[PDB]
Design an enzyme around this catalytic site. Structure first.
Site, PDB file in Angstrom:
ATOM      1  N   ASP A 127      -6.088   7.148 -10.580  1.00  0.00           N
ATOM      2  CA  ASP A 127      -7.268   5.958 -10.454  1.00  0.00           C
ATOM      3  C   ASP A 127      -8.727   6.266 -10.614  1.00  0.00           C
ATOM      4  O   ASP A 127      -9.311   5.297 -10.670  1.00  0.00           O
ATOM      5  CB  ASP A 127      -6.849   5.184  -8.997  1.00  0.00           C
ATOM      6  CG  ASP A 127      -7.645   4.082  -8.857  1.00  0.00           C
ATOM      7  OD1 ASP A 127      -8.558   4.034  -8.053  1.00  0.00           O
ATOM      8  OD2 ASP A 127      -7.261   3.052  -9.441  1.00  0.00           O
TER       9      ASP A 127
ATOM     10  N   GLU B 277      -1.013  15.059   5.955  1.00  0.00           N
ATOM     11  CA  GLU B 277      -1.034  13.672   5.967  1.00  0.00           C
ATOM     12  C   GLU B 277       0.212  13.191   6.700  1.00  0.00           C
ATOM     13  O   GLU B 277      -0.038  12.430   7.656  1.00  0.00           O
ATOM     14  CB  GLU B 277      -0.709  12.907   4.673  1.00  0.00           C
ATOM     15  CG  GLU B 277      -1.861  13.002   3.737  1.00  0.00           C
ATOM     16  CD  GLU B 277      -3.192  12.357   4.047  1.00  0.00           C
ATOM     17  OE1 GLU B 277      -3.145  11.686   5.001  1.00  0.00           O
ATOM     18  OE2 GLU B 277      -4.223  12.166   3.405  1.00  0.00           O
TER      19      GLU B 277
ATOM     20  N   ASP C 205      -9.652  -0.511   9.737  1.00  0.00           N
ATOM     21  CA  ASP C 205      -9.735  -1.841   8.893  1.00  0.00           C
ATOM     22  C   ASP C 205      -8.578  -2.447   9.260  1.00  0.00           C
ATOM     23  O   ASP C 205      -8.374  -3.817   8.663  1.00  0.00           O
ATOM     24  CB  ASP C 205     -10.236  -1.489   7.299  1.00  0.00           C
ATOM     25  CG  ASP C 205      -8.906  -0.956   6.640  1.00  0.00           C
ATOM     26  OD1 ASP C 205      -7.881  -0.571   7.227  1.00  0.00           O
ATOM     27  OD2 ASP C 205      -9.230  -0.934   5.466  1.00  0.00           O
TER      28      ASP C 205
ATOM     29  N   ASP D 166      -0.905   3.308   6.756  1.00  0.00           N
ATOM     30  CA  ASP D 166      -0.805   4.362   5.979  1.00  0.00           C
ATOM     31  C   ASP D 166       0.659   4.877   6.236  1.00  0.00           C
ATOM     32  O   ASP D 166       1.189   4.791   7.269  1.00  0.00           O
ATOM     33  CB  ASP D 166      -1.453   5.645   5.972  1.00  0.00           C
ATOM     34  CG  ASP D 166      -3.241   5.418   5.949  1.00  0.00           C
ATOM     35  OD1 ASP D 166      -3.420   4.584   5.161  1.00  0.00           O
ATOM     36  OD2 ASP D 166      -3.752   6.161   6.892  1.00  0.00           O
TER      37      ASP D 166
ATOM     38  N   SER E 142      -5.372  -1.785   7.812  1.00  0.00           N
ATOM     39  CA  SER E 142      -4.432  -1.312   7.111  1.00  0.00           C
ATOM     40  C   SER E 142      -3.598  -0.125   7.662  1.00  0.00           C
ATOM     41  O   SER E 142      -3.970   0.019   8.794  1.00  0.00           O
ATOM     42  CB  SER E 142      -5.057  -0.819   5.646  1.00  0.00           C
ATOM     43  OG  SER E 142      -5.876   0.356   5.717  1.00  0.00           O
TER      44      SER E 142
ATOM     45  N   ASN F 231      -4.992   2.337  10.376  1.00  0.00           N
ATOM     46  CA  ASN F 231      -6.426   2.322  10.172  1.00  0.00           C
ATOM     47  C   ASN F 231      -7.489   1.284  10.923  1.00  0.00           C
ATOM     48  O   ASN F 231      -6.919   0.226  11.167  1.00  0.00           O
ATOM     49  CB  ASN F 231      -6.607   2.349   8.679  1.00  0.00           C
ATOM     50  CG  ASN F 231      -5.927   3.418   7.890  1.00  0.00           C
ATOM     51  OD1 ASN F 231      -5.248   2.828   6.987  1.00  0.00           O
ATOM     52  ND2 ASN F 231      -6.127   4.529   8.231  1.00  0.00           N
TER      53      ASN F 231
ATOM     54  N   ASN G  71      -1.869   3.867   1.567  1.00  0.00           N
ATOM     55  CA  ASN G  71      -2.431   2.904   2.232  1.00  0.00           C
ATOM     56  C   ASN G  71      -2.242   1.497   1.784  1.00  0.00           C
ATOM     57  O   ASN G  71      -2.469   1.264   0.778  1.00  0.00           O
ATOM     58  CB  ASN G  71      -4.063   3.207   2.370  1.00  0.00           C
ATOM     59  CG  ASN G  71      -4.882   2.233   3.161  1.00  0.00           C
ATOM     60  OD1 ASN G  71      -5.399   1.315   2.650  1.00  0.00           O
ATOM     61  ND2 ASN G  71      -4.610   2.542   4.458  1.00  0.00           N
TER      62      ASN G  71
END
Ligand SMILES: [Cl-]
Ligand SMILES: [Cl-]
Ligand SMILES: [Cl-]
Length: 129
Positions: free
Chosen positions: A101, A35, A48, A52, A50, A46, A59
């Site tokens: 989650d 990562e 979209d 990280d 967003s 990203n 994110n």
């Protein structure tokens, strides 16, 4: 801060990540390697919109607030900047929520693609832990 491999393993263990939700320490170190290359200041934008953040590239769509991700949540209740600190506490606490989650470490696409099913113990081999 760019952590050493064993240094990060030790810090993650200190913060209770070792075997958290059944994921051995090598899984977490491997995820961080791919990562962020162990760099707490890593950021990546990203498609979209967003972003990280940090050693585990957490994110802003779901987990932290950066003020510039429309329609997003902040489920870890932290500014995304907290995920860039040399102190990994915020990243670890948020990762604990993420991995709980529902999909385990598959939340980290890079863990799924590069760590899952591999000899992850290699990542902590030789480390005084
Ligand atoms: Cl391991
Ligand atoms: Cl936002
Ligand atoms: Cl990937």
């Amino acid at each position: 801060k760019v952590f050493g491999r064993c240094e990060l393993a030790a810090a993650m263990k200190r913060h209770g990540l070792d075997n958290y939700r059944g994921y051995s320490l090598g899984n977490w170190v491997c995820a961080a390697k791919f990562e962020s290359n162990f760099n707490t200041q890593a950021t990546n934008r990203n498609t979209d919109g967003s972003t990280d953040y940090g050693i585990l590239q957490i994110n802003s769509r779901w987990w932290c607030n950066d003020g510039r991700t429309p329609g997003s949540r902040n489920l870890c209740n932290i500014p995304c900047s907290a995920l860039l600190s040399s102190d990994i506490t915020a990243s670890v606490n948020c990762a604990k929520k993420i991995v709980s989650d529902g999909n385990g470490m598959n939340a980290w696409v890079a863990w799924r693609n590069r760590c899952k099913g591999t000899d992850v113990q290699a990542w902590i081999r030789g480390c005084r832990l």
